[PDB]
Copies of this chain bind each other. A is one copy, B any other.
Amino acid sequence: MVRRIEDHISFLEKFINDVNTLTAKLLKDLQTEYGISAEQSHVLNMLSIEALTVGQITEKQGVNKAAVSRRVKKLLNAELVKLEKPDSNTDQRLKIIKLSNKGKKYIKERKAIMSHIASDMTSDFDSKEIEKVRQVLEIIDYRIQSYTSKL
């Protein structure tokens, strides 16, 4: 079973980006309606989970110092993302940012489009068998977290 998991990891690595490629194509309309960019829906999304700093966002994907700040430099500018303390400076390491009601009603319009196409894709399933999936994926998740802590 040493060649087995290399597959289950290869599949996920497949099923994963087939969820990625989809999202983007399936969403492009509301990213031209809201005028952003993929590499921004993926940035918005992360705070649609809960508030983050710019220093907190960088570690997650690419360790781009401020090449990712030119990507939040637009985000705020388009009203979407809003600030920490309306007190004025030129400080960027201080502030923490969250989504404004505009980057929030984007999200309502986002998790409505997927909370359609997937509600379909799965409308025929056993729940006492889709939980038995959720669960297993909760663990491998949890684990993945109590390891996204350590080394």
Contact = CB atoms under 8 A, between A and B. Distances in A.
Interface of A: 1-2, 4-6, 8-22, 24-25, 28, 31, 37-39, 45-46, 49, 59-63, 111-112, 114-115, 117-119, 121-122, 125, 127, 129-130, 132-134, 136-138, 140-141, 143-145, 147-148, 151
Q: By DSSP majority rule, is chain A's interface helix, strand, loop, or mixed?
A: helix
Oligomeric state, in copies: 2
21 contacts: A5-B118, A6-B111, A11-B138, A11-B141, A12-B19, A15-B144, A18-B144, A18-B148, A21-B60, A22-B144, A22-B147, A24-B60, A24-B62, A25-B59, A25-B151, A38-B62, A39-B62, A121-B147, A125-B136, A129-B136, A133-B133
